[PDB]
Design a protein around this ligand. Structure first.
Ligand code: ATP
Ligand code: ADP
Ligand code: MG
Ligand code: MG
Lengths: 422, 422
């Protein structure tokens, strides 16, 4: 109580003493030093009866509130905390050891929480407010931040921070986790090596980026690969890799470098493969053009819960991408460009699997016909609640991309894998 | 070590001695002479013992770093080096003999690399920086330069210099490489000299542009040729040639001059032939129009793995133009415009082959009918792994374009070559 009252009085005095805009104009170190000096002066003026440690703690709290992330700072610093959920200014939950717990942390009010959320989202050039209540982003340290504004979040601004996991999986791990059978792993190796235009669809948090990172491991080291991303997630191991990242528009609305611009430039950097960190806009069109004009092996990842939905989503993205084209034009462009679709999915038990490996066979009339080389069949459930299933090959001995395999001498391995998991 | 340490010390002394702005004001010759004199004086003062050749090499390197393009200079000098790709200050690949390879060339740091890139772009007036991180330009000597600034390129500024190839393969070379048999070479010469409408399709890296450049050697000197290219690659030897290049939009999205606009104008420039570097968009329509409207002999490369795929790609490209043309109308336009399609493919063993020389016979209901005059048949593969095959004439004695050959007086050569290949 006494500490809280002293902190409130000191904050009010500081607010009445200086304007936050001036400090914001200053650097973090200079602003923090000035805030500490002003807080010490205010404490001396008020003759607050507290220890030097209490004064330092109050100064640190004031500095964090003015420019830091407020009460989240101790939680963000902590490593064991995997997730932080703030359901309004007065409810803060943290995930520790896989269990959600209610912390005593509290914000001053929904306005302070909204300011903190706006700071966090702007840290990556994103803006959240009444006009744009919802904002999802990925911070540079790899944590995912989701924010909803009061207009939608009835009980106050809602914030979710999912902190980055250190480790990253490999195809061997996926085989171990039963995400894909060994024959499926071999077929994926053939698909990646033989320069097949890939689309790695999947639901949110279903392993799209991890699967793409594993797939890139099959690219030949000699190939010049150009990776475009919004958050710099991939960790390709090849020597000749060019890592590009989009630049979101500044607060003035200028300086934007969308993924479409990155892909258009990539067409002029003499790459062999263009790897888009995630297709969500007009770049799809360009990417498909890249797939269909000599940049074979270009891989992208897409948000879709099934290959059919992935194809429909790609068609829509091309449609809204400025250019007005016939639906059949876009459909046959997709058919010509995309060779394989891999459906990463999350099961009802929360586990992750590679449900579909599918070929874009062709276009019949106005319907894109595809064939599933590999499908995951769920056959029940275990005693612990975990889903139970198995990956089975559809038995297609000659997939549409067989020629590509022949071009690289991988046709023998493709046949072996397709036969060994019938 | 000793040489590197001496070079570093000399560079530091020169930086502390001569102002960069003053040297920039001075001309290249005077600046170089002053820099050489200052470096010699500094070496004498430092009492550094080195050979005359070593001292001259160090002075030249220092001058290049101060004024030239630093370690990038020798790579530009070498003729055999086609492309130079710098991914950050520590990695430099060069395309030699058509294969990319890493080089021990390393820049001092990313700041030096960015400075060199800025100087290179400014040489043609363009400027690249954080405000405009992406810069694509054509140097006066014809080399294309693409630069990506650090904010987009995570690993440091990315540079791509595609040098213009001085010498290009001729039809004699293609005959030597067994790409086309001598009878096929004669038939191609007849097709080129007959002002036959042409489309040179092909797969990735299949030599479409090289084949087009070879075929343009048959154009009569007196014809007024007009060339449209996204990137200047063709080198026609005729006297009356007009070379045009598209201008991609700046980052502001302004000033774009698409290849469609270039061909639209070319229809007004009173040409005898229009040579489109590569048809990959709506420009197809305009190109096809040029073929209908008396500009007989127009050529254009296209990405496709077979003549049927080339025709389908042309239809799709025409549909992309926004005109409400039905499919039947587009097929009729293609049949009436295109005369011969040359499909060049790259085989498994890396060999280039002119797989097909096929006419566009006509249009049955909904289906374009083509007849292959010349076909490359693969009989298998030798124990060395190379694909074994031969070029065979289909036996069509009177090609659809026979009348044009008779008009130009080449019909007898055409018949002789077709019979000999038979
Ligand atoms: N096959 C798998 N088996 C087990 N754990 C997995 C698997 N794939 C991913 N994970 C774990 O789940 C996390 C999901 O993050 P990931 O980047 O792979 O997902 P995503 O599909 O890109 O999702 P988002 O929609 O957030 O981009 C991975 O970081 C890893 O921790
Ligand atoms: N018929 C051929 N035989 C041997 N090499 C070839 C042939 N055609 C092209 N090349 C080589 O291939 C390289 C690239 O070919 P390119 O002109 O880019 O074809 P495309 O434009 O279809 O990719 C050239 O540097 C050339 O040396
Ligand atoms: Mg992802
Ligand atoms: Mg070309």
């Amino acid at each position: 109580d006494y500490y809280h009252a002293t902190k409130t009085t000191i904050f009010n005095a500081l607010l009445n003493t200086i304007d936050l805009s001036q400090l914001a104009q200053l650097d973090l170190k200079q602003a923090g030093e000035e805030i500490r000096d002003i807080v010490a002066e205010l404490v001396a003026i008020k003759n607050v009866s507290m220890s030097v440690a209490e004064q330092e703690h109050l100064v640190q709290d004031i500095i964090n509130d003015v420019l830091g992330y407020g009460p989240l700072e101790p939680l963000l610093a902590r490593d064991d905390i995997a997730d932080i959920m703030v359901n309004g200014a007065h409810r803060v939950f943290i995930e520790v050891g896989g269990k959600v717990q209610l912390t005593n942390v509290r914000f001053r009010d929904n306005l302070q929480l909204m300011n903190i959320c706006q700071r966090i989202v702007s840290q990556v050039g994103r803006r959240v407010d009444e006009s744009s209540p919802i904002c999802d982003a990925r911070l540079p340290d790899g944590s995912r931040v989701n924010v909803i504004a009061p207009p939608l979040a009835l009980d106050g601004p809602t914030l979710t921070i999912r902190k980055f996991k250190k480790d990253k999986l490999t195809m061997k791990n996926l085989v171990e986790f039963a995400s894909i059978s060994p024959e499926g792993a071999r077929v994926l190796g053939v698909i990646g090596a033989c320069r097949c235009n890939l689309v790695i669809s999947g639901g949110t948090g279903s392993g799209k980026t991890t699967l793409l990172n594993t797939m890139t491991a099959f690219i030949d080291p000699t190939e010049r690969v150009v990776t475009c991303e919004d958050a710099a997630e991939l960790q390709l191991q090849q020597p000749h890799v060019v890592r590009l990242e989009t630049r979101p528009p500044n607060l003035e609305g200028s300086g934007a470098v969308t993924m479409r611009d990155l892909v258009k430039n990539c067409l002029r950097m003499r790459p062999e493969r263009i790897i888009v960190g995630e297709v969500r806009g007009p770049e799809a069109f360009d990417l498909l053009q890249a797939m269909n004009t000599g940049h074979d092996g270009s891989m992208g990842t897409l948000h879709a819960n099934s290959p059919r939905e992935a194809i429909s989503r790609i068609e829509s993205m091309i449609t809204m991408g400025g250019y007005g084209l016939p639906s059949k034009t876009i459909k046959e462009m997709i058919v010509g460009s995309v060779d394989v679709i891999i459906q990463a999915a999350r099961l009802r038990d929360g586990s992750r699997r590679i449900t579909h490996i599918t070929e874009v066979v062709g276009l019949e009339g106005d319907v894109i016909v595809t064939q599933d080389l590999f499908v995951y069949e769920i056959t029940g459930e275990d005693e612990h609640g975990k889903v139970v299933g198995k990956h089975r090959s559809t038995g297609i001995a000659r997939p549409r991309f067989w020629d590509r395999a022949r071009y690289y001498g991988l046709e023998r391995e493709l046949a072996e894998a397709l036969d060994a998991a019938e």
